[PDB]
């Protein structure tokens, strides 16, 4: 088995079903004692909550699902009727996901998309039926975030007020998303400094609210 398979398994037999708040304190359990894995994590995803009870999106994108921990933690305080579309490249983790959230008993709320991010985003309004965007968390790969936040515009998904939210933009580092967005116009910026899930290393998120054309 893989490590992802194990937290998993880890989650399944450690935590209670039908309750987000204990998968979510499994899997940082399982990634503090036993195996590092790139979840957001606790301290990072403090800052999340934080953000997603300031603005209450009804419509949110993930780029890059991974176990799921991201999409448990930000749609167990989604309201009734919201949504969560994550998408996620590798099939294998895309499973892991679903089953994941369907333990947490969050499924109805979230729809895990199995593609790359840059052949999902056209689809979105055509196929998923999609208007534009509330909010979108970016923790794919570090140079997928400034394409596709272009590509996210192109296709007209953001509206004035969307928020993106970013991971990892100090460690691994987004330096042409940063310099992008911090730069133009069209983001309104801020940075909330913290550290790399599960170490004593300075990491931190970046928000970025979109302000039209
Ligand atoms: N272009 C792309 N489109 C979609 N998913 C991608 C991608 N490039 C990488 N990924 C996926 O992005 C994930 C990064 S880890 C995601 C962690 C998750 N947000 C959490 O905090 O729990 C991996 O599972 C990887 O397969
Ligand atoms: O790629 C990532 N996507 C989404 N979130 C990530 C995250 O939160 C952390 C890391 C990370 C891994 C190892 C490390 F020493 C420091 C940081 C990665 C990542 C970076 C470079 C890599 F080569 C492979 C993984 C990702
Ligand atoms: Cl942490
Ligand atoms: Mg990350």
């Known amino acids: 088995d893989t490590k992802e398979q194990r937290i998993l398994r880890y989650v399944q037999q450690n935590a209670k079903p039908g309750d987000p708040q204990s998968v979510l304190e ?50 167990r305080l989604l309201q009734p009727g ?3 579309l994550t998408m996620e490249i590798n099939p294998d983790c895309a499973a892991i996901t679903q089953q994941m959230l369907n333990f947490a008993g969050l499924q109805d709320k979230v729809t895990i998309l199995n593609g790359a991010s840059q052949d999902l985003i056209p689809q979105l309004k055509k196929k998923y039926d999609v208007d534009t965007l509330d909010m979108v968390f970016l923790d794919h790969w570090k140079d997928r975030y400034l394409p596709d936040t272009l590509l996210l515009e192109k296709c007209g998904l953001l509206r004035k007020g969307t928020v993106l939210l970013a991971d990892n933009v100090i460690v691994p580092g987004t330096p042409d998303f940063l310099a992008y967005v911090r730069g133009s116009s069209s983001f309104e910026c801020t940075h909330y400094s913290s550290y790399l899930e599960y170490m004593k290393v300075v990491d931190g998120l970046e928000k970025a609210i979109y302000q039209g054309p």
């Open 26 to 75: 499994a899997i940082d359990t399982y990634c503090t004692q036993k195996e590092w894995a790139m979840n957001v994590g606790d301290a990072k995803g403090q800052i999340m909550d934080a953000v997603i009870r300031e603005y209450s999106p009804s419509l949110v994108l993930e780029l890059g699902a991974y176990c799921g921990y991201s999409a448990v933690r930000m749609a």
């Open 82 to 84: 919201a949504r969560l």
